[PDB]
Amino acid sequence: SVGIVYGDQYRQLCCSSPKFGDRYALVMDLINAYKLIPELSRVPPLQWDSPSRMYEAVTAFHSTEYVDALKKLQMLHCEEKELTADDELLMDSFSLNYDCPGFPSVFDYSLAAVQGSLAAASALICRHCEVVINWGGGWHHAKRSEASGFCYLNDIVLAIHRLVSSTRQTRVLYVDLDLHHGDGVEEAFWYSPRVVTFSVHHASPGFFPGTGTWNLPIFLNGAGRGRFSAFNLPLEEGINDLDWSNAIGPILDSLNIVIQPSYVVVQCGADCLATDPHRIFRLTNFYPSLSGYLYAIKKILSWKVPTLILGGGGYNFPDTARLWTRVTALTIEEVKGKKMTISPEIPEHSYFSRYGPDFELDIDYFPDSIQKHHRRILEQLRNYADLNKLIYDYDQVYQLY
Ligand SMILES: Cc1ccc(C(=O)NO)cc1NCc1ccccc1
Ligand SMILES: [K+]
Ligand SMILES: [K+]
Ligand SMILES: [Zn+2]
C-alpha cells in the first residue's frame, strides 16, 4: 500500500503561508488530475486529545519556551496592533523575524506539517502502508529553539524520533535531496548513531545555511557515540541529471548495504530543478536523460525498506507539482508493480492555466572533485561501521564506486 497525507482542513492550512502560497493545492490537484488518487491510501493528519498532549509531542524536540513564543506570535498577528518593544525582543531571541516572519496562521500552519508527518510515521510503524508521501512536510532547517529558512517546526525530526522509538536495533537512514543542506535534522541527531543522515546540496561562500562542507579545514561528521554518522556531499553549481545521479548513486547503495536501515526518510525539495528561480542546479523531471530525483527515488524504493517521502523547498510552483506528480506515480509503480501511464499533456483541471504557455508535463528546459568526495565518504562509512561493530563486505562496497 502507498499512502499520501491530505484532508480538507490540511489543504487550507498548508496554503495559508505568504511564502508558499497555494503550492500544495497545485501539487495535490495535479496528482488528482492524473487519476492517481484512487491508487493511494489517504493518511489523515494526526490530531491530539488535549493541549497538553500536543505540547508533549512537539516538545519531544522543541523547547517549551519556543513553542510558547510561536503560539504567541500567531495570537499577536491576529490582532490589528503592532508588537511592543518587549515582544519584538522575545521573537528576535527565537529568530522569529526576517526569513521567518509572523502571519495570522503561522502556528497552525507549522503544526499542520507536524501532524501530517507524524501520522505518516505511524502508518509505516503499524505496517498499514509500505510507503507514505507528505508533500506538506519536509521543513529541515528548524532547530530546537530557533526558526530558520521559513521552517518553524521540524516535522522531519519529530517523525524520525517516532520511528526510532518504536522498537538487533532500529536504525533510520535520512536522505536529503534539497538544494540546501539539511542542517536542522543533522544537528538533532549529531550524537545518535541509530539515525544516519546524508545530505547532498549546493554549498559556496555566503550561500544558505553555510554548513554541510569544509569547516587546513576538515569535515565534521558527528560526535560522541554519533561520530561518523552525519554524511554530506556538497556540489558546485551547474550540475546536471547524469552527473548528480552518478555522484550520489554509489553512496546511497553503500549506506543501505552497511547500515541496513529499518526505515528510510527522504526529503525531496524541488529547488534543484533547472527552472527553479534559484538557478543553481540543472536537474529535470524527465522520465524516458533521466531525472536525478526519479533515479534516486527508484533506487531507494528498490531496497524494499518502509519509506517516508517528504516535500521541502521548491519555488516554481507548477514545475514543483510536475516533479512531485512524477515521483508519486513512480512510487505507485515500484511498490504495487502496476504500470502508470501519464499523458504528456497537462489534463484540464482547476489550475490548468498555471501550466502555460506549453501545458506539457515535462519542464521547459533544454539540457575529480566528486572522486575525492567518494574516497572521503567511503572511509567515513568504514569508520562508522568499525565504531558501531557492524558487519559488512568491504570488497563489495568498494566495487560500488
Ligand atoms: C533564504 C532561504 C532559506 C531556505 C530556503 C530553502 O528552500 N530551504 O530548503 C530558501 C530560501 N530562499 C528562497 C527564496 C528567495 C527569494 C524568493 C523566494 C524564495
Ligand atoms: K540537501
Ligand atoms: K547521526
Ligand atoms: Zn531548499
Automatic annotation (TrEMBL):
Zn(2+) binds at residues 178, 180, 271. Its EC number is 3.5.1.98. Coiled coil: none annotated. Residues 22-329 form the Histone deacetylase domain. Its main location: nucleus. One of its GO terms (biological process) is heterochromatin formation. Keywords: Chromatin regulator, Hydrolase, Metal-binding, Nucleus, Repressor, Transcription, Transcription regulation, Zinc. It catalyses: N(6)-(2E)-butenoyl-L-lysyl-[protein] + H2O = (2E)-2-butenoate + L-lysyl-[protein]; N(6)-acetyl-L-lysyl-[protein] + H2O = L-lysyl-[protein] + acetate; N(6)-acetyl-L-lysyl-[histone] + H2O = L-lysyl-[histone] + acetate. The lineage of its organism: Eukaryota, Metazoa, Spiralia, Lophotrochozoa, Platyhelminthes. One of its GO terms (molecular function) is metal ion binding. Belongs to the histone deacetylase family. HD type 1 subfamily. This is histone deacetylase.
